[PDB]
Ligand binder design. Structure first.
Ligand SMILES: *[C@@H]1O[C@H](CO[C@@H]2O[C@@H](C)[C@@H](O)[C@@H](O)[C@@H]2O)[C@@H](O[C@@H]2O[C@H](CO)[C@@H](O[C@@H]3O[C@H](CO)[C@@H](O)[C@H](O)[C@@H]3O)[C@H](O)[C@H]2NC(C)=O)[C@H](O)[C@H]1NC(C)=O
Ligand SMILES: *[C@@H]1O[C@H](CO[C@@H]2O[C@@H](C)[C@@H](O)[C@@H](O)[C@@H]2O)[C@@H](O[C@@H]2O[C@H](CO)[C@@H](O[C@@H]3O[C@H](CO)[C@@H](O)[C@H](O)[C@@H]3O)[C@H](O)[C@H]2NC(C)=O)[C@H](O)[C@H]1NC(C)=O
Ligand SMILES: *[C@H]1O[C@H](CO)[C@@H](O)[C@H](O)[C@@H]1O
Ligand SMILES: *[C@H]1O[C@H](CO)[C@@H](O)[C@H](O)[C@@H]1O
Ligand SMILES: *[C@H]1O[C@H](CO)[C@@H](O)[C@H](O)[C@@H]1O
Ligand SMILES: *[C@H]1O[C@H](CO)[C@@H](O)[C@H](O)[C@@H]1O
Ligand SMILES: [Ca+2]
Ligand SMILES: [Ca+2]
Ligand SMILES: [Ca+2]
Ligand SMILES: [Ca+2]
Ligand SMILES: [Ca+2]
Ligand SMILES: [Ca+2]
Ligand SMILES: [Ca+2]
Ligand SMILES: [Ca+2]
Ligand SMILES: [Ca+2]
Ligand SMILES: [Ca+2]
Ligand SMILES: [Ca+2]
Ligand SMILES: [Ca+2]
Ligand SMILES: [Ca+2]
Ligand SMILES: [Ca+2]
Ligand SMILES: [Ca+2]
Ligand SMILES: [Ca+2]
Ligand SMILES: [Ca+2]
Ligand SMILES: [Ca+2]
Ligand SMILES: [Ca+2]
Ligand SMILES: [Ca+2]
Ligand SMILES: [Ca+2]
Ligand SMILES: [Ca+2]
Ligand SMILES: [Ca+2]
Ligand SMILES: [Ca+2]
Ligand SMILES: [Ca+2]
Ligand SMILES: [Ca+2]
Ligand SMILES: [Ca+2]
Ligand SMILES: [Ca+2]
Ligand SMILES: [Ca+2]
Ligand SMILES: [Ca+2]
Ligand SMILES: [Cl-]
Ligand SMILES: [Cl-]
Ligand code: NA
Ligand code: NA
Lengths: 642, 641
């Protein structure tokens, strides 16, 4: 039969569970023993009457571990009136709360990503309480915090594990670790707690792109900055951890290739440097996005707008260009001597590629005062005449143009230029004097030389070649061209005929000088050729009438001394000295007749000597004054009559 | 001086810009000419009046490209009254919209991660309009969508570039591509359009862990399921692309080594198989988290709660254990023959480790009807006595216990057991006969043997060895211990004295037989020794009185034959035959007297011849029957007066 008692674990040995003999009204005898003791039993039985007392130590957690019931079963045998009996006894061992919740370790380290969704579960080491029932772990508490809570769950074989659950989204940059106190406690007003620490390690996600310390940057860069010049040390920052926050600098992928060759970005430090050479006169502003990138699985990027303003340097000098209105030779401007005052000759351009004062030009002209500088428009100055030009006075000019910029120091450019004045037919031939006077002795040879005329045209080339022409004029009906000829190149006048003074005294040539111009220019002069007389006409006796060189006149013997017989008149063709007639009645032996040398009047020296019938011959000559003189003779006879 | 006109690009050649002679009130002359004719000039001037017309085509976009202003400069020279003059002229060339916005290429390919925050800018190929001012690129057109909204920004050098900007979070699993044709038109009333293709390709991020078609699953596993048995084909899914969505199955990191050695998960297919062996009697429920993992750089994981409930099979047979109250040998129970009805002898345990009917046991006992089975508690049956036991009748019993479980089919276990009955001193010695009788011849030697007695004790060991003792009783005053002795071991009786029948006829010995037990048991018997006579008593003659064998008697002579003279009496000490008196009348010569052998009376044969004075001599003897017979002698004389 089954008799049942109840004990309480870890009681002092020798406590009264019960007594069989008395509990079951057992009158008779008893030799109460346990039937077998393979291990040293925990309960002792009084042989006298079957009293069951706590023998050794009774630890429920050692004999039943986590089993909800713990019954110690023993078989006692007795003897009553020579009958051996058996009684089966079951002693329920009640549980005492002599064990407290325990955790494996004082700290539980756990890891979770900041990118995990709310509700993600994180395992925790289970607590254990070696008691059973209410004396086992009933409740769990977590320390007050914002993010984490616990939930307890039981497995199908009854093992009661715990989970840490995430309530709010994490951010490792705000908070990267958590320290939470975890505790478990059992039932019954005598309550026992056990504790541990949860160390939550928040693992980083790359949820932050880099960002530059400054969103945009401008830097100034001299256009003569040397290679390696440091423009700027770019800086960025990333809050993420380790590689996710480690930055590498460079260009935005859209930056053209010119910039990538001109400028360089150190990928580690962000230094931005010049590797090429810039030129303000070509491009004065660069605009590009630099970028920063973190070294993460899914990299994040940020950009910074960089502006480089290039600054101008005086690296250009003035350029002088000269373009003439009219010219043939290089670097020579031509202009007609006919150009009026303030005529444009050539245009000067003075330019400077730079900007500001460095590109501003002052132009100055050096040369004869006949030319002036006149500004036409920006950096464009005209050369203009200030006075009338005269090729015959000045045929060319050498000029000098200087152009300086306003840099400090300034660049100076110098250039030379030549002006040549074009000929117009501005001057006509000019005879030394308008009227020339020359003389020619009568009875010349034919083809004799009289004179030469000269006219002058100072114009050059064909416009200044003189041509001489005999103007056609009449001379005693006939034309001038028959008496005289003129070499049209030299202007030499040659006589074609032999001239006779007795006929023609003066010959008036009219010569024209012409240039080889278009229109032709002419001028006239006159040569007054003088023919002067000579002694080629001997005088002739007119009265008395001549008969083969002889004559006769009679004389009355009735007449006085110094008689008026006859009057010898004579004529000469020449002029002046050569027409000075002097008379002589001479060589007669006896002095018979006497002559008046003035008016050729012949008188008698002797008295009336004979009566009648006398013949007397003498000679009477007429001469002129010129050298050599010529003369003619008349032989006249006189007779005495009554 | 600078005189200013204005024209419009690509106008009809020969069109009138203006007239210098008339515009500048130029009275006088003019032989208007250009100074520069080294390249083929695009403007020609009429000599008469200085009016210049468009010679060739004038294309602003080719002489000034993208330059805001386009002024052609020309230097003309005239001659007025022999004076050469110069006039500088600036002809503004105005732009018309004979050029349309355009994009460098027919397609713009673009890639963006679905994980990019709002506001991320994607650069786009810049548009170009070769006109200037309002005729330049003024407007950018965007396609209506929820995620991409673009923004136009202007640079230091005035070009209007456009950025593709994202305002709302993308999801490549929701939407993975976009195709947007990008075009722009310029300002001013006649607008010209130009276009390209934008192909937005969304790149995948590993933003979705795998998840199982079922969060938990339970499977039943027979405890005799063979190695390789298929428990379950795990299935999991991942929306992500390529390797980010390709799964490998295995155990959660917390799974003990017992489970990892016992069960196996194929990483590729997720098949869960038994490689070891389970035993319901050892562990009947397994619980573990299987997990699936995507093959991504930093993979994402999911778990599935797997329950394996083990099923019981009848793989254990009942075990029989027997524990006796009292025992010496292995597998042998002892019990005293003194036990009463229904005394506990031994406890049988019949158990089966299985569960259900497979573990439920029926116990049956086979053997002598003196023992039966009585259940004490669960799987615990008592062997009990049913009747009184007697070691002397049955000392040992061979029993058999049978224990079957209730499986289908059932397991049966048999066991043998032996019970031995312990001896108690329940029996006392008992003699063959209660009263023994033997005889002894008189006059025996001293120290002679009479008989031997034997008693019987069936009890065992000391409880059955008999010792005999002579009970102290008196015989004619003295104690019996003096006539006889008893050997306590053999039971032999030796005669101590020599016995005389005349005195002692019957000797009543009282023997006790006792066993060697505690308490000691005794029983008594009696030996009646009878003493029988012998002939060691010679008889003597009493009447008449004797004198060394002689006597004398007188008688008167007056009588005939047969007279009463004298009467010869004798006595014998023995009994029976040896006390048989025989009378003899011995020789006297003459036939004088004759004797009656019955009553010892002697008479006379001859008459009275003599009166007085005669002496007569004879002998008369008495004898007994025994062998040898004994006799004494007496001589009697008779005389007359
Ligand atoms: C204007 O300038 C011309 C150009 O000549 C010069 O060339 C350079 C070397 C520099 O000196 C410049 O400053 C200058 O422009 C002058 O022409 C030169 O004239 C001289 C003298 O008349 C010539 O030399 C002569 O040669 C002949 C024959 O060999 C000799 O008989 C003379 O005795 C004399 O040495 C020279 O050839 C000529 N140069 C050229 C290139 O033609 C010119 O004098 C000047 N005009 C004025 C008005 O100043
Ligand atoms: C109770 O059991 C004992 C011993 O246990 C027995 O051992 C074997 C026989 C097993 O097969 C078991 O089945 C069995 O329980 C029995 O004792 C045996 O008795 C036999 C009786 O014939 C003996 O054999 C005889 O022995 C004599 C003298 O030695 C010979 O002259 C005969 O020719 C014959 O062989 C045997 O020796 C004996 N053995 C032992 C170990 O004791 C016993 O019989 C049994 N009791 C009952 C009532 O069945
Ligand atoms: C166990 O102990 C804790 C303190 O460690 C208590 O707060 C709890 O209520 C239980 O008694
Ligand atoms: C659990 O354990 C902690 C530290 O071990 C204690 O501070 C707490 O009161 C509880 O007993
Ligand atoms: C080209 O087309 C666009 C619209 O498609 C207009 O903005 C433009 O004016 C031109 O017609
Ligand atoms: C610009 O060009 C596209 C083709 O690339 C046209 O489809 C569009 O209408 C616009 O004219
Ligand atoms: Ca305890
Ligand atoms: Ca406890
Ligand atoms: Ca507890
Ligand atoms: Ca963060
Ligand atoms: Ca982060
Ligand atoms: Ca980052
Ligand atoms: Ca430069
Ligand atoms: Ca410069
Ligand atoms: Ca300069
Ligand atoms: Ca002149
Ligand atoms: Ca001239
Ligand atoms: Ca001239
Ligand atoms: Ca002459
Ligand atoms: Ca003359
Ligand atoms: Ca003369
Ligand atoms: Ca155009
Ligand atoms: Ca245009
Ligand atoms: Ca346009
Ligand atoms: Ca997605
Ligand atoms: Ca995805
Ligand atoms: Ca995935
Ligand atoms: Ca099993
Ligand atoms: Ca089983
Ligand atoms: Ca079974
Ligand atoms: Ca008995
Ligand atoms: Ca006995
Ligand atoms: Ca006995
Ligand atoms: Ca005797
Ligand atoms: Ca006798
Ligand atoms: Ca006798
Ligand atoms: Cl003459
Ligand atoms: Cl005797
Ligand atoms: Na830096
Ligand atoms: Na599968």
């Amino acid at each position: 039969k089954t008799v049942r008692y109840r004990t309480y674990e870890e009681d002092e040995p020798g406590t009264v569970i019960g007594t069989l003999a008395e509990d079951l009204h057992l009158e008779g005898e008893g030799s109460f023993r346990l039937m077998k003791q393979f291990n040293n039993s925990l309960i002792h039985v009084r042989e006298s009457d079957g009293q069951l007392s706590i023998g050794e130590r009774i630890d429920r957690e050692r004999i039943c571990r986590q089993s909800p019931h713990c019954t110690l079963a023993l078989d006692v045998v007795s003897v009553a009136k020579e009958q051996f009996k058996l009684i089966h006894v079951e002693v329920e061992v009640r549980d005492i709360n002599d064990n407290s919740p325990r955790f494996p370790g004082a700290e539980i380290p756990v890891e979770v990503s900041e990118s995990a969704p709310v509700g993600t579960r994180i395992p925790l080491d289970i607590a254990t309480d070696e008691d059973v029932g209410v004396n086992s772990i009933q409740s769990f508490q977590i320390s007050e915090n914002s993010h984490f809570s616990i939930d307890v769950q039981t497995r199908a074989d009854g093992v009661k594990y715990a989970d840490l659950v995430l309530m709010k989204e994490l951010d490792r940059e705000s908070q990267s670790a958590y320290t939470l106190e975890l505790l478990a406690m059992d039932g019954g007003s005598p309550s026992r707690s056990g504790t541990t620490m949860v160390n939550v390690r928040v693992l980083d996600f790359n949820d932050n792109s880099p960002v530059f310390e400054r969103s945009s940057v401008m830097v100034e860069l001299m256009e003569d900055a040397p290679v390696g010049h440091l423009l700027l040390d770019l800086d960025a920052l990333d809050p993420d951890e380790g590689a996710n926050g480690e930055i590498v600098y460079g260009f935005s992928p859209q930056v053209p290739q010119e910039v990538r060759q001109l400028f360089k970005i150190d990928a580690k430090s962000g230094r931005l440097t010049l590797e090429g050479q810039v030129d303000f006169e070509t491009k004065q502003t660069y605009e590009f996005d630099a970028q920063a990138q973190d070294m993460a699985l899914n990299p994040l990027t940020a950009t910074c707008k960089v502006i480089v303003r290039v600054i101008d340097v005086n690296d250009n000098a003035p350029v002088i260009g000269i373009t003439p209105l009219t010219s043939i030779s290089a670097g020579v401007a031509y202009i007609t001597e006919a150009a009026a005052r303030e005529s444009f000759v050539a245009l000067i351009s003075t330019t400077d590629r730079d900007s500001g004062q460095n590109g501003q030009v002052h132009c100055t002209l050096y040369g004869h005062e006949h030319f002036r500088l006149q500004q036409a428009y920006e950096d464009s100055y005209m050369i203009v005449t200030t006075s009338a030009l005269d090729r015959e006075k000045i045929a060319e000019y050498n000029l000098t143009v200087v152009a300086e910029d306003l840099g400090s120091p300034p660049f100076k450019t110098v250039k030379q230029y030549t002006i040549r004045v074009s000929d117009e037919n501005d001057n006509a031939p000019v005879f030394a004097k308008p009227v020339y006077e020359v003389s020619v002795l009568e009875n010349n040879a034919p083809g004799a030389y009289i004179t030469t005329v000269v006219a002058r045209d100072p114009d050059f080339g064909h416009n200044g070649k003189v041509i001489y022409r005999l103007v056609e004029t009449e001379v005693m009906g006939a034309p001038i061209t028959t008496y005289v000829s003129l070499d049209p190149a030299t202007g030499a006048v040659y006589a074609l005929r032999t001239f006779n003074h007795e006929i023609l005294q003066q010959l008036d040539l009219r010569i024209q000088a012409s240039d080889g111009g278009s229109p032709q220019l002419t001028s006239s002069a006159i040569i007054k050729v003088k023919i002067v007389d000579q002694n080629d006409n001997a005088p002739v006796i007119v009265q008395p009438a001549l008969s083969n060189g002889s004559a006769e006149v009679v004389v009355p013997s009735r007449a006085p001394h110094g008689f008026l017989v006859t009057h010898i008149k004579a004529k000469d063709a020449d002029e002046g000295v050569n027409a000075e007639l002097t008379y002589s009645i001479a060589d007669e032996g006896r002095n018979v007749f006497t002559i008046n040398k003035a008016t050729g009047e012949v008188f008698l020296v002797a008295d009336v000597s004979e009566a009648i019938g006398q013949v007397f011959r003498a000679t009477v000559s007429v001469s002129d004054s010129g050298r050599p003189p010529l003369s003619s003779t008349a032989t006249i006879t006189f007779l005495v009559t009554h």
